[PDB]
Symmetry: D2
Subunit: 247 residues, 4 copies
């Protein structure tokens, strides 16, 4: 057998929302570390793009279609993964939010997200319980709109993510399964490049590092949490925001 | 890897035993040149021997973080003989019910003093990593919970404030808050106290010194460059404050 | 089976000027005490329970303490129950401008069900508060709730949800001069906690700096303050009322 | 019975530091209104005089004294003078700030040393009476850094002291104001003011009196199970 810091050789990782941005970068980073990676999207064209992306970077795995809002989609996708690859022991929940946004959208957004986390988490626990090992990692939503509406939704989503992460970690810990979260700040993605320049330039002034974070910078934190060295880290939400904190 | 610290000098205080030692070895494993410190000459010597015995380049020196003179002189010695430390880990630190105030105040004064003195070099290089290690859980009574919570709160606020001050310079400042770790202090707490702490830990075990160190090594890496002002708890799911 | 039961001295505590307050889960403990304290402060109080016999007990309790108001049946998990009860209250007493939500594997569903209840009831009373350009919504957390190990998970989760929810709703409705706050009780003196054996009780007390259980009345005074004009700049806050015992 | 309970402060001596203007003044008047005998303090003789005049003009019994909370000598002597002439202060509100002009660290360190000094000195009297209220007022809203740091220290300190003294039926709490209408905030340019307002859900500045009502509640018998808490009074604007 092998035994190395940071290596995920021989593990199957499931990464939801893997077709663009943060999710893509997470998939490639777990690939780089030796995991067999199943990335998912909500559509066939995204699943295809994921597979192509993985192949082009020499990562074994697949792209599949998964709707985390559906008990059926989740059970079937898991069974398919079990049949063809094995039990995913590393699961990164990144699949999230589907006029501009307002300060009254928080409730639904957060409720729908945590129902999805719970559903998928619950379904992969059986396999992690059997192996007496696991990593669940929840990715929070990026800071996405500049005003009060945007600050409200972001803070609410971060708060739910934290409480949920901490509670699940407490339930499953006795089985040597860690549950953590990563809370990104202002990241360079498709959403943030197409904010108007006034809203965007205002955000830089609130960030001590004086830059946007990169998708890869979220992914390195996730890859660490997945490793054997982060085994005593559980129930934590690691903020990755260049020093700007808004709750 | 990209976890690599090849070509960097790291200073790790309180490096002669437990968590500090394990931090020194882990930064060594990652390729840093490591200066570990203790409060006595024999500890400095033990550090050097420990580093040699694990194939890590660096040294052991004597440092009293409570003293402005000790700090200035040690830094100047490090500057003369090996270069500017761009990774600095502050680890050097029954209980009493009124001891909290002085304990915390003394710790944060030590953090500030040492941090301030190494900033000049990090500012020049336009790069740095400062990592603050909180106190391990173990203290017996209500007194012990009080001191732990107070020390964690101070550590967090301090870490966050310093991170804001120095961030424009691409220096990150973070903290690691250990829970119940297997060390010299904990390995013979009475069994009732130990069992009680286990029962509050979801993972159902003590953490290892190495498990704190891996977190520190990650924070020091280029891949943790957007993490700053954070206190990362490393406690197996046991949260108390 | 009746589901609506109603009930020249001028006490100086009466600064609530006949305002109508709705207090869910008002038949026992903390909820009862909140109902009486808002009564003492001069509000017209509608306390609710899930059954007709509870609604009756509420009305009897209010009458026996000289508080105007009623006991009604309300199921906060039901859109129909909430819409109908509110309309009944509107028709017979007026718009409730003070609303205290106290009616409350396991960990997940408990918190999710609770916050859905808070949201439902809160959303339904907002129209009337918006019209009056004044309101107070106060959310009562899970009493401990959780004693040793497995329970504490449920308590911390419920507190985290309560706090984030409270803070978000407060941001949404603030421009209308409606405050939204929460009160997070620690270990409160009830039937359950009095009948613990002395060893278990002494151990619990040793975790509480004040060295005693809190009283129901002591939660209620906080709620009554938050409902007042003087707490008008307090919004989005969760006020812990736990004698110094903080469980993270 | 139900109706006559009151959480008035009749028969208690309250000490309020920094009482000559704004928040501190309004605290002094609110504890006066509630029936306490109030000693307000300032760092100068002219402030102590203004305090006494203010109290007299609102029919509140008490005094204005000079107190420098950064000085062990000033604290001991003032307390002894209060003990001799009025009685043991059992309600103590720490509102007096201290400036250093690396600011972030020294400001917070100087403040908490003040809180600790004064708190320690008034504990003997509260211990003797087996009753007390200590209330710590945070700073009103680089600037975000100093505010967050000062708030974090205030919280941890408040919580630790509360644990130490609780067995004696003394509560220790804090009030963290957001953007309040005071002398400092009445001179902001409109762009900076509008920006702050747009971050405040209530859409207005808080009043001094609104901080004071929270303090007066915490001082009452009905807040007796509230300890170790920091109550934010910021109209829904939370800076972490
Ligand atoms: C709908 N919703 C759920 C929130 C939430 O935090 N839920 C939660 C917490 C802990 C454990 C399990 C669930 C939550 C938080 C803020 C706003 C809305 C929320
Ligand atoms: C003496 N003391 C200082 C505490 C503390 O929080 N200091 C601090 C905070 C932020 C920045 C700089 C300094 C602190 C916290 C809890 C208990 C005691 C404390």
């Amino acid at each position: 057998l092998y035994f190395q810091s940071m290596s995920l050789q021989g593990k199957v990782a499931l990464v939801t929302g893997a077709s663009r941005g943060i999710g893509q970068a997470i998939a490639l980073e777990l690939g780089r570390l030796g995991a067999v990676v199943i990335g998912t999207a909500t559509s066939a064209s995204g699943a295809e793009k994921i597979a192509e992306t993985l192949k082009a970077n020499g990562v074994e795995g697949a792209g599949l279609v998964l709707d985390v809002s559906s008990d059926e989609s989740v059970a079937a996708t898991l069974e398919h993964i079990q049949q063809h690859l094995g039990q995913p022991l590393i699961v990164v929940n990144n699949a999230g939010i589907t006029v501009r946004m307002k300060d009254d959208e928080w409730f639904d957004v957060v409720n729908t997200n945590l129902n999805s986390l719970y559903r998928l988490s619950k379904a992969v626990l059986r396999g992690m319980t059997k192996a007496r090992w696991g990593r669940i990692i929840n990715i929070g939503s990026v800071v996405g709109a500049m005003g009060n509406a945007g600050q409200t939704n972001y803070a609410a989503a971060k708060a739910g993510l934290e409480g949920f992460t901490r509670a699940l970690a407490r339930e499953v810990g006795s089985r040597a399964i860690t549950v953590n979260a990563v809370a990104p700040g202002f990241i360079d993605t498709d959403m943030t490049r197409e904010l108007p320049e006034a809203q965007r330039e205002a955000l830089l002034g609130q960030i001590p590092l004086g830059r946007l974070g990169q998708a890869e910078e979220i992914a390195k934190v996730v890859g660490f949490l997945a490793s054997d060295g982060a085994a005593y880290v559980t129930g934590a939400t690691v903020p990755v925001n260049g020093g700007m904190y808004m709750s």
